[PDB]
Design a protein around this ligand. Sequence first.
Ligand SMILES: Nc1nc2c(ncn2[C@@H]2O[C@H](COP(=O)(O)OP(=O)(O)OP(=O)(O)O)[C@@H](O)[C@H]2O)c(=O)[nH]1
Lengths: 45, 136, 389, 228, 108, 463, 22
Amino acid sequence: EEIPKTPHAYKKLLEKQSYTEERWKYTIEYLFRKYEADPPELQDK
Amino acid sequence: AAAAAAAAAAAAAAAAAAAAAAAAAAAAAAAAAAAAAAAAAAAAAAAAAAAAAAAAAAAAAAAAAAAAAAAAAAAAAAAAAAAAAAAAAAAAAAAAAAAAAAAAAAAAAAAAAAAAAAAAAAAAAAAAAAAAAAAA
Amino acid sequence: MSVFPGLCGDVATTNYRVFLGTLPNLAVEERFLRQVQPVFPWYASRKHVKEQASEFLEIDLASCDPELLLRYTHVYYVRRQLYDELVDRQLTLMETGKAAKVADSALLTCLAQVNAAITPRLQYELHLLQQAKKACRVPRRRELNPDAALEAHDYLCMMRVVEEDVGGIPDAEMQARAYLPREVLEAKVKELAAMIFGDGGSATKGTGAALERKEQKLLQRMIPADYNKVGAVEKLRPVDVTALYRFTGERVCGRPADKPFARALWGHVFRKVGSHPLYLQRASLYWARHSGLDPQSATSAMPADLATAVCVQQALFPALKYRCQYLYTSPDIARQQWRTGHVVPLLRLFPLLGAPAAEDLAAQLVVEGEWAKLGIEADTNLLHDTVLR
Amino acid sequence: TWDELEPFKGLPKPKVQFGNEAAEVIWPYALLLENVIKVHPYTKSIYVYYSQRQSTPLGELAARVAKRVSQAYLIPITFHNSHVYVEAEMLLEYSETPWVVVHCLDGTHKLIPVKPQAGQTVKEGAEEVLNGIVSACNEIGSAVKNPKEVMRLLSERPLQNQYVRVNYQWYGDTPEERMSHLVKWDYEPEEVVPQLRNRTQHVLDWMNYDGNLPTHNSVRVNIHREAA
Amino acid sequence: FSTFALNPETSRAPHGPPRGLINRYISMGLPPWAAWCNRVNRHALYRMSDVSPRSFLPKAPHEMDVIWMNERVRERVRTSRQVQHVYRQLKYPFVKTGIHYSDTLDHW
Amino acid sequence: VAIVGRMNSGKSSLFNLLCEDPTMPAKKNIVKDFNGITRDCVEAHAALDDLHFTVIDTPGLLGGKLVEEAFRTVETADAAIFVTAVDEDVSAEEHDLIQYLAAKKMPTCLLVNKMDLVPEEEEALVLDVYNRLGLGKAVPFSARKREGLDMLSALLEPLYHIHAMRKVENDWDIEDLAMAGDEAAMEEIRDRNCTDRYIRVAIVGRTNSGKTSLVNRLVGYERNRAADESNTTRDPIEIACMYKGRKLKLIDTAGLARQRYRTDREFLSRIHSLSLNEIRYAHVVIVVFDATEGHPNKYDMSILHKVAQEGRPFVLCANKWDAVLDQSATAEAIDFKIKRQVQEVKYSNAVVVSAHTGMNLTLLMDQVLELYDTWNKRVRRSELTKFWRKLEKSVIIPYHVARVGRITQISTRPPTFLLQLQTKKEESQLPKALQEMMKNAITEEFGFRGVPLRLVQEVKDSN
Amino acid sequence: RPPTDRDFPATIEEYELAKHHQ
RNA sequence: ACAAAGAGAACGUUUAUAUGUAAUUGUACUAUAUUU
Ligand SMILES: Nc1nc2c(ncn2[C@@H]2O[C@H](COP(=O)(O)OP(=O)(O)OP(=O)(O)O)[C@@H](O)[C@H]2O)c(=O)[nH]1
C-alpha cells in the first residue's frame, strides 16, 4: 500500500501486519503470565 | 630499610583491604593516609600491633581447641560433626565484628592528626583487651 | 512464607554478603513466625540454636529468680510425671506427619528429615490444619478480627472483673511493648490491621492479646505473679472461646464502615470451630515446653539434652514468672470444668462474668499465705484437662 | 538474553510489585488509544487493592472485576492524563471486597468499594466499577476549597506516566511524526530556529530551494558540454 | 557567573517572527524551519508552495516508452559553502529492466 | 589507576586535570558532548600534588566487539575510580559494573562529576542514591568548577603510598632472581639502569584501514586497539610498551586532506591537528598506507614531506601487503614513486608489511631502530671540510648562480649541519638547486639516508 | 485538554467524556 | 569519474565518500598584544 523507503519504515510496516494477522494478540493481553500466581513454586519442589 | 616497610605493611594490610571495592568512608580513607605519612601516627602504629597477635593467637588457640574438641570428645562428634564447626566457626566469624566496631569508631571521628591517633588507638586496645576475657 | 507477607515485606533486608542477610528481631515473635510457617531445615534449625545459646549466653551473666515457688515445684513435679502419656501420642502424630508428607501443599526440603528440636513448631502448624476441613482457617478469620475491633472488645471485657478500677489505657511504653509480639500487616491506604488468632488468645506462651491485657490491666495486681496469672488466663479463655470469638468478630469493613453491605459482618460459625482446637491441641505439650525450661537451674543444662522448645521471652523471668506459669492453668481448668467454660454458647451475662472474680477471690486468699492449701485443687485440674486416650 | 526492553533502558523503573508489575507490560499504542479515559483535572492518584485468596463466592468475583480494571482500565488513565499516578497492589490474604483509593490535589482521598452485583460479568463488572470512579468520585473533586492553589500544583505536577512502556507500533515514536497529519502552530518560535552553523545553506538543500541565488559558472560550462 | 552570562534578561526578539514566517509557511505545507530561506519574493513563494511542480518528462507523453508511473525528471538544487551561488542538476528515476512473467501469455 | 566507562566525557574530562610532560600538555581530553567520544583505552602520566601515577581510560559501550578491549586494560590497572553523572544516577550497566568491580577484587573510590547542575538543597538526594551503590561514600566532584580535587584524588593517596612499597619489595625480590636467569638479568637494568630517551615511533597515514592493526601485532598481536575494518572510522591517540633492545614507545594517528574535512571532530576543531601535534614530537615516524590500493596517493607523500620538514626521520610501510596479489615489481611503484620526482624524501627505505601475516614486522623494528641511529650522528668537523672541497673541485655551479665561494668549514651543530661561505660578506643564501645538491651529497657519503633530511643553515664571516 | 484526541479516529474511537458549557 | 550503501545488485538510478592536479586558481589583576 505504502512502499517503505526506510528499514525503519519497513520494520514499522511489519508491525502493522502483526496487528492484522494477530489482532487477538493485541485486543487485550496475549496471556497475562504476570498476574496469575506469580511465586507459585515457592512450594512443592 | 626493611623495618619501616614491615612496620607499615602490617599496619596497612587492613587499609588496603578496607578498599574492598568501597574505599570511601570517613577514616577508611583519611586515617589510612594519616599513617602513610607516618607523622603523629606512633600510637596507631603500636595500637594495631597488639591487635594482630590477639587475632592470631585467638586464631591458633581456638582452632586447636576446635579441632581438639572433636578428637578429645569423639563421643557423638563423628555423628554430629557438622554441628560442631558450624557453631564454632560462627563464634570465629562473630569475632569479625571487631572491625565494624573499629572501622566505625575510627570513622566516627573526623580524623585529626593526634586527636584521632589517640582517641582511636586507645579504643582499639579496649576492643583488643575485650578479647582478653573473651579468650577465657 | 506467603502466609506472612506483611512481616517479611516489612523487615529490613540488609545486604553485605551475596546472601541478602535478612534482619529479624529477638523480642518480636517473628522468631516464632520464622519457625512456624517455613519448611526449610536450613533456617528453621540454625536460628533455633542461635536463640537457644543466646539466652544461655546472657543467662550466664545476670541474676535470676529461679524456683521462687520452691514448695510448689515438688507438687509441680507430679504433673511432670503424668505428662509423659499425652506427649507420647503428640509426637507420634508428627512422627508420621513430617515423614509421610509426600504431597504438594507442605514440602520439607528433606521429606525424610527426622524429627528434631526444631520440628515442633513447623509441625505443630500442620496438625492445626488437620483438625479442620479447609485452608487456610487462620488468615480467612484474620479478615474478620480487626485490631481496634478487638481493642474495645477486650477492654470492656476487663471492666467486667474490675469496673471503675482501671480508668483508661495501660501506658504507651506497654502499648509499644504490646506492639512487639503482634505481627505487622498492610499499613496501606484505607485498609486496617487485621489480626490472626494467635494474637488473641494463644496459650503457647504469655502471648494472647487479652492474655496481654490482664497481666497489666487490673490494678489489683502486685509483684506476686499469682493475681496476674490466675486472671491472665481468665482473659485468655473468652477470646479463644468459639462462642464469643464468632460473636465478637466483625468484618474488616464493619470497623470503619467502608461497605454498606457484607456477606456476613458477624464471624461465621463453621470456622471458629478451628481456633479452639488450635487452642486446645498440644495442651500437654504446651506444659512440657514450659516445664522443660521453667526452672532456671535445670535450664542451664537441661534443654539441649531434653525434647523441649526454647524462646527468648523465657529470659524475661526464669522461674519467678514462667514457673508461676505452671500455676495459672490450674485454676484455668478448675473454671471451665466448674463454671462450664468450654461448652457455654453464651458467656457474657453478669453472673457468668461475676463468677471468675470469686474463682480468684476464693484462691488468692488461699495462695496468699496458705500456699500448700491451694495446691490440691491446683493439682487435680491436670488429670482432668487431658485424658490418656 | 535478548534485551526485550532495549528501547526503554533509559526510562525509570516502575514501582515493581505483586499486582503492580503490569505497569511494565509493553503496551501497544493500538491497545492504548482503545481506551482514552479522561479523569477530572483535579485527580492526583488512583489506587486499586485486591487480594490473592478469597473465601466468599462473591468475594472471588469482586477480586476479579477489580483485577481486570487494573489490567485494562487503569494504565490508560496514567498514559493519557499523566498527572494521575496509578498503582494496583494485591494483598496476599483472604478478603471479600477490594478497594479503590482515589486521591485529589487537595489531599482528599475517597472511598470506592468494588461491590459487583451477583449476576454481572467481568466485562460489565468493570464498566459499573469504573463509572463509579470516573463520574461519581472524580467529577465530585470539582468541590475544591481554593480552586487556584489546587491548580498551580497541576501546573507544577511533573509527568508521572514516564515509567510506562508504550510500543508506538507503526505510529511514529515521536509526538510530531505521530500526528504527521495535523498542522500544529504549537511550536515556540525560538525552538524552530535551526542553529547548525550554516543554516539557510543546509535549509535550502533540505527543502530544495535556490533562494534567488545565481547558478554557478560551472553550470553553463556543463550545458555547453551536454550539447550534441 | 561571567562573560557567558545569560542572566534573567532576555534577547527580546532574537530573530524569525512567530507568523511573520512560521505560520505563513506552516499554513502552506512547509515546516517552521523553512522560514530560514535565503530570499523570497511573491514569485519565489509561488515556487515554494509547489502549486505547480517544476519538472518535466524526457519525451513527449504520446511517445514515451519506459513506463513512468508518477516520476518526472526533477532538478536538484544544492548551494555553495556560502550563499553566493547554487548548482543545479536533473535527477532521474531508476529504470529497472522489468523481466516479469505474465500468466495470460505463457512467457516472460 | 583507570577511569570507568559510563557513556560521557567526564571520565574523559577527569583525565583533563592530569596530564604532565614537557612543553606540550597531552590534552587527549576529547570532551565533545555527544554521548561517548573516546574509543580506546588511552593512558597517560598524571600528577596531583605529589603522587605520580598513570591514569587510564576504559571507554566504549558502543560496538558489540569494542567493550572487550577495555577488559584487557581494566585488569592491568590495580585500581579504579567509578564516576557517575548527576544527570542519570542509577541504572543497569552502571550497577553491573559494580558487581563486576567486586568480582575482580579491585579497589575503587566513587566520585560524582558535574556536581554543579544541582541546587544548594537537592544534594541529600543526589548523594544518598550513590552511597547505597555499594561503592561507599560517593565524594562530590566537578571538572567545570575545578573543585573535587585536593580533597578527592588527593585522598586516593593511600594507594600510592602502598604501591610505592609493593614495588620496592619486588625490587628486593626480583633482584633475588637476578642471577641466571633467562630473565631478570637485564630486567633489573630495564627498570632502573635503562636510561634512554624513549624513541617515540609514530604510525601515521591516511585512515581507511584499522591501521592500528599493525600497531596491535607489534604490541603482542594483543588487540589493544580497535580494528576499524568496518569503514572510514576514528581512533584517539595511544601509547604502549617499550622494548626491542631499547625503550621504544608506539603511537597511532589519523590523516586526511583539508578539502576532505567533514565539519570538525575530524580536523581543525580536533583530530587532524590532534594527530599532527604528536608528529612534531616523535623521534621516528612510519608513514603507513594500504598496499592493496597500489601506489601511495598524492597525499600519501605529503605526510612524508611534512615529517621531512620536521627534522624527523621517516619510513614508508605498505601495510596490507598480503591482500595484494603479491605484486612485486607491479606494486613496486611504491619503490618508484618515491623516486620519480619526490625531492628529498627519496633515499627513504620503503619496507613491506602485513599485520595478520607478520610479513616483516621484525624487519620493521630494524628500520626504525636504525633511523634513530642516523637521526643522531655527528661528523668530525675535519672530515666534512676535506670532503666538500673535493665536491667543489667537481661541481658545475658556474659562480654566477652562486657568487659564493668555497664553503669554508661546514660544521655539524646537530642532526643538520651549517654552511660557512668563503669570506664573502655579501649576499648570504644559496639557490635551491645548489641547496639540495649539497644535501644530496651528504646523505650519500655519510649514509644519513636514515633520515634523508637535514636542515642546512648558512651564515657569512662576521667582522 | 477537553479535546486534542481526534488523532487515529477508527483506531481511537474511544472516549469517556461529556461537554460542559460552564 | 571510481569504489560504498540500496534493492536474492543483468545491467539504467538516487545518497554517503578521497582519489588525478586531472585544470582552470591563487600563494613575497588593566592592560599591552592582534588583525598575516
Ligand atoms: N601472537 C603472537 N604473539 C607473540 C608471538 N611471539 C611472541 N609474541 C608476543 O606477542 C607480541 C608479538 O610481537 P613480538 O614477538 O614481541 O615481536 P615484534 O613485533 O618484532 O616486537 P615487540 O612486540 O616490540 O617485542 C609481543 O608482545 C610478543 O612478546 C607469536 O608467535 N604470536
